Write an enzyme that holds these catalytic residues in place. Structure first.
Site, PDB file in Angstrom:
ATOM      1  N   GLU A   1      76.819  -5.923  52.446  1.00 15.39           N
ATOM      2  CA  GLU A   1      77.095  -6.019  53.964  1.00 15.39           C
ATOM      3  C   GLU A   1      75.982  -6.800  54.556  1.00 15.39           C
ATOM      4  O   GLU A   1      75.633  -6.751  55.818  1.00 15.39           O
ATOM      5  CB  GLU A   1      77.116  -4.730  54.606  1.00 15.39           C
TER       6      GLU A   1
ATOM      7  N   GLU B   1      85.172  14.886  49.088  1.00 22.86           N
ATOM      8  CA  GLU B   1      85.484  13.902  49.777  1.00 22.86           C
ATOM      9  C   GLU B   1      84.955  12.323  49.112  1.00 22.86           C
ATOM     10  O   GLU B   1      85.001  11.259  49.687  1.00 22.86           O
ATOM     11  CB  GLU B   1      85.045  13.761  51.193  1.00 22.86           C
TER      12      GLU B   1
ATOM     13  N   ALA C   1      68.596   2.551  52.607  1.00 17.94           N
ATOM     14  CA  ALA C   1      67.157   2.439  52.987  1.00 17.94           C
ATOM     15  C   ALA C   1      66.758   3.045  51.432  1.00 17.94           C
ATOM     16  O   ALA C   1      65.775   2.492  50.940  1.00 17.94           O
ATOM     17  CB  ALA C   1      66.881   3.387  53.876  1.00 17.94           C
TER      18      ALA C   1
ATOM     19  N   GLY D   1      86.480  10.453  45.801  1.00 19.75           N
ATOM     20  CA  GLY D   1      87.215  10.278  44.659  1.00 19.75           C
ATOM     21  C   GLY D   1      86.778   9.971  43.221  1.00 19.75           C
ATOM     22  O   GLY D   1      87.017   9.868  42.336  1.00 19.75           O
TER      23      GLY D   1
END
Lengths: 424, 110, 424, 380, 424
Positions: D232, D359, D209, D361
């Site tokens: 996607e 979280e 969004a 990398g």
DNA sequence: TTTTTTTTT
DNA sequence: TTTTTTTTT
């Protein structure tokens, strides 16, 4: 060269001349056309032929049948039948020989039938559905040949079952073996008889160690036979602490603790007295080989006097055989020598097949359980299992049950937690 | 004998082929000969009831005769009358109870 | 050919003619019969012989001993002793040479003794128990040869221990190295001395990053030496944000947030002032090679003026050496060049051996901890560990403890969470 | 004796060096690895050298001659004679760093020619991996050359002063990229050129969004052209989403809808919706684009799907990185801002159900702007 | 020999003489210097040259351009152009040919550029930094050659987007295909048109099985076309129990239970009536091969009359192709024959791509979801997804939503849990 | 390795 | 592969 076994084959015929009962068994597995050597074909043919006519099986009669046919000078004369009678190792295994004959006979067919398929594979190249169909039929035909069909009819089982229950109730008698100060079992055992590979099995909680000891024990006190105890897991004196508590009725905890009274000192001082005159022979070696168990059992019998041999759980015996995960077989090799040993010293080699891993993990007994352990069930002339479950009211004890699952020609004990003993 | 000579010969051909593992080799050279010989018990000197009687005396009188190694803690000094010779002792525990404290302790009073 | 090392052997003798102290050490490890070349046998024999008689070890005396024996023209004359004196790399390593001699000597025996076993294996084939026994004895005999037995007696440890505590209390003095604005340590360090591979280690919570910075920092403000900071994990300005908060007493959170006051703007504007005249040289390169750390440290000294080098945790330095899981060795190769670097720029290469995985996971320090990290302990002339634990009452801080576990010739700081600093 | 690149003499020096002063080793060891040396004897000797090192034994003519003879290669490494030779050879030991340096160079050139030749023999032997090869052909040459920083143009306090001004006045001078959200417009004053942006989040907060958002306010109100790479979804779902937010079925929809379409029609946005993608095509197309229409932005919709490396042996760290870095790189090459979108899930769900900057990398690999929430910039 | 493909190359030119549209596409991918054979170079050069001048692409014109240049007798005369026109398989794939030409052209460069690096590797051995730099530049240069840059501008997407919404609202019409008793879809589908590979996909809870059945079903009742149902997972009568409950409005549970009333017996007896005259053709074979699906679909059309084909989830079809984990490809091979089959029987092969593992596990649809399943999306002329979520108030039902994600030239149903049906 | 898997409480 | 494991932020 087609599968065949003259050596086996000729061993079969010979088995028959060594004892007619041979033929009976044989005819069960083979048919004349199964033998490879033509000679053996006629000779078998002849044989079963005369056995049919009522004429007992033997050298002369067949010589007859054979001659009658104009077949003697054919199958090499009696001279060979003579030989035949010679060719077997021992009739008592005539089955095997025959089997082996059967197999070499069957594979012939798996090959002949197959080979014929290939030839047809190339020839009729004009209707293959059909081809495939019979190729299925044919093959299956090969499997349904081993003269199988050994269904134990219910009538035979029942008679057996009722005959088992009658002996059950007729078993009121006088012991003729080593008396086991346990009237219930004793009434069943009829005395731990000599030359018997005795196996008793169960789950953890050491419930077994106590029962064997208490046997060998009550055996060393009353009987005058000498007893041997192979507690690999348990040590020399460790074991004796367990029977001392048992014969004197001492609260071993009270003892390990050293928390002994003056009356306790007595019982203590007393239990020993009992065994002093007793005949108990231990060995707590870490793990020994069947080769040693033999040298020490055998040597004692000749020195003092052997009677019993209680080895504290067989699993823990070291197998000289070949290593790295073939225990199914390993045990198979040693458990088998034990049975061979129940024989030499003419004594009962009572063993306790116990466990830790699979039995404990199965939290929430019978034959299939030790069968996993493999072929101990076959060697054993007697197999017994110990079964006990786990009120807040005192007069503290626990009734253990003895479920003997087997015995060549053939209970309940209350347990005592305070002294680790057993009572009738 | 065959396997005896076979192992010995292993070391042999080895000594030459590993001029840089002296500590190692020696330790496994021992290992190898040891692995060809073991079976049953031995010792140095040429009935358990007895042993269990001698044991009971020690449990009774709380005495002794000709020997001595004071744990420095009668508690232990009482449950042993001395840390006997040729005995293997072990003291297991979880972190921070003083496994090492104790260790130094004994050796300290000793 | 039997294990032997002329090259090593002759290096030993020569070590002795290069300095008598050599012989002392040597005799510790070998014995004349250990040398392989006969010549070297006599020559050593001779040597230790004269060292015994009081006669100091040297060329002439042995020439004497040797001649006396009728052995010179035998071992090749002084000419070879001359050579001998030449054959060593550097006496200071005479131990090794000897060791190597010892080994080649010992293996000889593992082989000779073994070979003799085999010959007997075939000969006395008439009493094997005996054979096995001595085969055990013999072998063990080979191991118990390395002239071991280096037990550090308690008397020697104590004296050392008491001498360590006296210097402890006599350490009242004037710094002679780079002053560390931390009186406690400073009193211990006596000044971060030059040519010293300085290592300080600990667990996560970045408690270390702050302490090194604050050093290099308080070092850049007061001392006039130039300082270098290698924070691989932390970036250029990221680092400076940490010392700016520290020198000005700013609530960096207040700052990152930009939530700065007018007085805060001051402190802020103020901290900078301090460093403006300071001499701080950073490098936050992702991960560099020891080869580069050298080119930049070395080049600065020659350009401006090198004094300190604070590399933010060594583990994260890239080792040019050989890859894929030999860190024990990897660190061994780089940590070793750092020690070589504390030497060239005549400055203290303070490093912070820190951690994440093994230290944090050990939730619920000393030498064995970094020893896992391997041989940093040997190169380091000084190793220090930071230890801090984790009342609701204000006046908010936390006392961190400094446990220096080592120092060639040789604390407590309160920490400040609001500015990430350190106070005396 | 054969001829490709090799300075046997230099090598002999370096070896010789170590022998002369142990120190030589440890300095050489900072620049050379056994493999470095041209031939076998040397190769292994330096090795022995290096070997006795690790043991903790002092390297010198003995321990080497011993170790060498210990690892049975002595008689054929030259034997003691040749050994002593290299030894007596060097006269001193404080220039070694020089010869060492050359040796290395030779090493480079050799391995340089070696890799190039790999591609060569390859081109012929893989007539059916053109996309692949090209991508790994780049890879190979790149892997022979990298060490330290570069750039284009020929003190941090300053940078920290320039930074503070930006934090103070909240001003600016000659530049412009309106996030379309003063919040962000304030914490950046424009999505600077050649910067790599990242926005991490858990499912359904609107990672995409937002993505469309920015690029939306950027292509509509500014002359800058924004390209968006969606992995996607289809060019429609996007544009639908776009005029869907641009319009905020009944007639008020028809009118509000047309208004949005006309406005975004005139807008210059560029999309691509391909299954999986390679960072290299992205640049492939974006370089051409910037030369054909010129544009000042690029929005990526979650890169975890940018399987573009080739071999595929890596975690969520290596292929993700090679991308991240390749991304930054890309941005710098185009002189524009690259904003990507990524995802977290297990960690945040772990905490939020029962009742972060680590979280991700990729951001640890190389981004200089991470945002939740900002956490890196070259507050909330 | 350098990568090259005459066979492909000459196929390209020929494509152009077979249709000018060819050249357009071609010029997109290559440039004269890309072709390997010199001849083809000039001939392409010539071609695009004339296409520029306005002169349409064709044999004559280029012959001209070519001659004009003094190049005909060079490139082998028209005779070869004749040949050229012959050399292609089918212009419609002219892209590929060209691509292949492009590749063989590009690799040439990866090799030439590389080879040149090596030559320079040895030559300029006097400034390597520079060398490395251009070695980086050069290589990258090779990659940026594939005439990429296919950015779908937003203007083109929007027009498409608005044209999609106008057809959306203009779709008020008369069906011209198999009527689907589902006005909503029907209004979209405009009738399940023939020759269309129809795919509908979704998650577990069998929500799909019901929808296909109900289609084939409502299709068998009203349309007069015959329908085929391939429920591999579901059996012959198992399926019919599901539509019988659906057409009669029976509480199948009431039915499986046999708990049927007299009015229920009716509905029951009634549903059957409906189908009696219906035309439903099932096959519940365990798992069949695409090769069989064909023989039975095809054979029916010729026997009775084929119209629809509803195969209950494709994933479970057995792929004759090569085994052991290449499903991405496996499905690619079969799903592709289905599309080939929507063509032969001039009928809609509606399939239900469903799932268990990945869809159910994603607890907490669009194209990327089935794309994982691979290239079904390309073959499918129509792809549809079923989406339904999971008040305590009665009048018990659940509104399912139909999200068709694709259609060559191009909803909502309430669901009924009591009869497993679907309503408008 | 010219019809064949010779150790490790 | 005629005493020997020459790459992959």
């Amino acid at each position: 060269i087609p599968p065949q076994s003259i050596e086996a084959e000729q061993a079969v015929l010979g088995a028959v001349f060594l004892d007619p009962t041979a033929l009976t068994l044989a005819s069960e597995r083979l048919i004349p056309e199964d033998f490879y050597r033509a000679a053996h074909q006629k000779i078998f043919h002849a044989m079963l032929r005369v056995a049919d006519k009522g004429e007992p099986v033997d050298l002369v009669t067949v010589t007859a049948e054979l001659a009658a046919l104009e077949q003697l000078e054919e199958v090499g004369g009696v001279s060979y039948l003579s030989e035949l009678a010679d060719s077997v190792p021992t009739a008592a295994n005539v089955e095997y020989y025959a089997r082996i004959v059967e197999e070499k006979s069957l594979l012939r067919r798996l090959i002949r039938t197959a080979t014929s398929i290939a030839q047809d594979g190339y020839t009729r190249e004009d209707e293959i559905d059909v081809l495939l169909d019979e190729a299925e039929r044919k093959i299956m035909e090969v499997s349904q040949r081993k003269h199988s069909g050994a269904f134990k009819n219910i009538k035979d089982v029942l008679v057996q079952t009722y005959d088992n229950i009658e002996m059950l109730h007729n078993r009121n008698g006088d012991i003729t073996g080593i008396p086991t100060g346990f009237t219930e079992l004793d009434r069943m055992t009829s005395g731990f008889q000599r030359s018997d590979l005795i196996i008793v099995a169960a789950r953890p909680s050491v419930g077994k160690t106590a029962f064997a000891l208490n046997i060998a024990q009550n055996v060393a006190t009353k009987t005058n036979e000498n007893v041997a105890i192979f507690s690999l897991e348990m040590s020399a004196q460790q074991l004796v602490m367990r029977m001392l508590c048992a014969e004197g009725n001492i609260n071993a905890q009270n003892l390990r603790t050293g928390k002994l009274t003056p009356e306790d000192w007595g019982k203590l001082t007393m239990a020993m007295g009992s065994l002093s005159n007793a005949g108990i022979y231990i060995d707590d070696t870490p793990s020994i080989r069947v080769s040693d168990i033999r040298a020490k059992c055998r040597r004692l019998k000749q020195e003092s006097g052997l009677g019993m041999v209680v080895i504290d759980y067989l699993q823990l015996i070291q197998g000289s055989g070949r290593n790295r995960e073939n225990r199914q077989q390993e045990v198979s090799e040693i458990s088998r020598s034990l049975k061979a040993l129940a024989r030499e010293l003419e004594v009962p080699v009572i063993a306790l097949s116990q466990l830790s891993r699979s039995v404990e993990q199965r939290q929430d007994p019978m034959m299939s359980d030790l069968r996993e352990s493999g072929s101990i069930e076959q060697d054993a002339d007697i197999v017994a299992f110990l079964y006990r479950d786990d009120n807040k009211d005192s007069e503290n004890k626990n009734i253990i049950e003895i479920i003997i699952a087997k015995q060549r020609n053939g209970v309940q004990l209350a347990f005592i937690k305070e002294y680790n003993k057993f009572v009738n």
